Amino acid sequence: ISMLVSSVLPGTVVDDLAYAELYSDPPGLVPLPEEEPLIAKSVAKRRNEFITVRHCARVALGDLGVPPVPILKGDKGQPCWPDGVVGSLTHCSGYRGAVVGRSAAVRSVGIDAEPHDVLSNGVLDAISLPEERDEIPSAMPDGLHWDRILFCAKEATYKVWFPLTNRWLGFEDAHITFEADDSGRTGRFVSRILIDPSALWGPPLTTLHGRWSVERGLVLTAIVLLEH
Ligand SMILES: CC(C)(COP(=O)(O)OP(=O)(O)OC[C@H]1O[C@@H](n2cnc3c(N)ncnc32)[C@H](O)[C@@H]1OP(=O)(O)O)[C@@H](O)C(=O)NCCC(=O)NCCS
Ligand SMILES: [Mg+2]
């Protein structure tokens, strides 16, 4: 099938990026030796997911011109990319995906996949602002689980943010606004950061523009920031 993450990478960015995805855990994918301590005591389902996602990452790197390398885990769980590379990883039920780019062209990337299923009201209240719960249902087509799409967009926001700030970003630290395309299955979002927006260097992260998509029972979101 066609790759789902394509739908949330706009033309302005897609040619600076490489990506790969899978919808299962193929047998005989293996970790690189350096990675094995990370999943040595993990349950098989996590072990295999980890392996598959790292495999997608190396396939994408390969497309970028980067030889296969181990991808370790940093201090706050972030992937350790090779120098000169930025990227993002995501998994959920029925999806494993990776997007990478060269850091000379791409400042940061965050992606996230979720099942297109409802969230509990308890979760919705923890991850949303009162104003989002008022605004989004009007912006989004009936039938979309906009609670999950919101949640997915917030997680993508953190992933694009952390490599540029090395600071925490909570769910109530960004206000997300949505629009829907005519298809009703794709659209844009903007995350407005509500805390100190300063990057470690360069321009501040004040308003982050992303894309969302619903297809094959999945929500995909992505934010891509280019180097200017
Ligand atoms: C870490 C988190 C963002 C992961 O998102 P998720 O949708 O639950 O799970 P995903 O499978 O999509 O993503 C997991 C991957 O995120 C990546 N990740 C973890 N921490 C990260 C960080 N600090 N920066 C960037 N990427 C990170 C990892 O690569 C991980 O996979 P791996 O363990 O195989 O290497 C999420 O679990 C979380 O804890 N969020 C709290 C922060 C947040 O979302 N704030 C909202 C800001 S508006
Ligand atoms: Mg997710």
Automatic annotation (TrEMBL):
<feature type="binding site">
    <location>
        <position position="112"/>
    </location>
    <ligand>
        <name>Mg(2+)</name>
    </ligand>
</feature>
<dbReference type="InterPro" id="IPR003542">
    <property type="entry name" value="Enbac_synth_compD-like"/>
</dbReference>
<keyword id="KW-0460">Magnesium</keyword>
<dbReference type="GO" id="GO:0005886">
    <property type="term" value="C:plasma membrane"/>
</dbReference>
<dbReference type="GO" id="GO:0009366">
    <property type="term" value="C:enterobactin synthetase complex"/>
</dbReference>
<feature type="binding site">
    <location>
        <position position="155"/>
    </location>
    <ligand>
        <name>Mg(2+)</name>
    </ligand>
</feature>
<feature type="binding site">
    <location>
        <position position="155"/>
    </location>
    <ligand>
        <name>CoA</name>
    </ligand>
</feature>
<dbReference type="InterPro" id="IPR041354">
    <property type="entry name" value="4PPT_N"/>
</dbReference>
<dbReference type="InterPro" id="IPR037143">
    <property type="entry name" value="4-PPantetheinyl_Trfase_dom_sf"/>
</dbReference>
<feature type="binding site">
    <location>
        <position position="46"/>
    </location>
    <ligand>
        <name>CoA</name>
    </ligand>
</feature>
<keyword id="KW-0808">Transferase</keyword>
<dbReference type="GO" id="GO:0000287">
    <property type="term" value="F:magnesium ion binding"/>
</dbReference>
<dbReference type="Pfam" id="PF01648">
    <property type="entry name" value="ACPS"/>
</dbReference>
<dbReference type="InterPro" id="IPR008278">
    <property type="entry name" value="4-PPantetheinyl_Trfase_dom"/>
</dbReference>
<feature type="binding site">
    <location>
        <position position="91"/>
    </location>
    <ligand>
        <name>CoA</name>
    </ligand>
</feature>
<feature type="binding site">
    <location>
        <position position="113"/>
    </location>
    <ligand>
        <name>Mg(2+)</name>
    </ligand>
</feature>
<feature type="binding site">
    <location>
        <position position="90"/>
    </location>
    <ligand>
        <name>CoA</name>
    </ligand>
</feature>
<protein>
    <submittedName>
        <fullName>Phosphopantetheinyl transferase, PptII</fullName>
    </submittedName>
</protein>
<keyword id="KW-0479">Metal-binding</keyword>
<feature type="binding site">
    <location>
        <position position="76"/>
    </location>
    <ligand>
        <name>CoA</name>
    </ligand>
</feature>
<feature type="binding site">
    <location>
        <position position="54"/>
    </location>
    <ligand>
        <name>CoA</name>
    </ligand>
</feature>
<feature type="binding site">
    <location>
        <position position="73"/>
    </location>
    <ligand>
        <name>CoA</name>
    </ligand>
</feature>
<feature type="binding site">
    <location>
        <position position="114"/>
    </location>
    <ligand>
        <name>Mg(2+)</name>
    </ligand>
</feature>
<feature type="binding site">
    <location>
        <position position="169"/>
    </location>
    <ligand>
        <name>CoA</name>
    </ligand>
</feature>
<feature type="binding site">
    <location>
        <position position="159"/>
    </location>
    <ligand>
        <name>CoA</name>
    </ligand>
</feature>
<feature type="binding site">
    <location>
        <position position="112"/>
    </location>
    <ligand>
        <name>CoA</name>
    </ligand>
</feature>
<dbReference type="Pfam" id="PF17837">
    <property type="entry name" value="4PPT_N"/>
</dbReference>
<feature type="domain" description="4'-phosphopantetheinyl transferase N-terminal">
    <location>
        <begin position="34"/>
        <end position="100"/>
    </location>
</feature>
<feature type="domain" description="4'-phosphopantetheinyl transferase">
    <location>
        <begin position="108"/>
        <end position="185"/>
    </location>
</feature>
<feature type="binding site">
    <location>
        <position position="158"/>
    </location>
    <ligand>
        <name>CoA</name>
    </ligand>
</feature>
<dbReference type="GO" id="GO:0009239">
    <property type="term" value="P:enterobactin biosynthetic process"/>
</dbReference>
<feature type="binding site">
    <location>
        <begin position="90"/>
        <end position="91"/>
    </location>
    <ligand>
        <name>CoA</name>
    </ligand>
</feature>
<dbReference type="GO" id="GO:0008897">
    <property type="term" value="F:holo-[acyl-carrier-protein] synthase activity"/>
</dbReference>
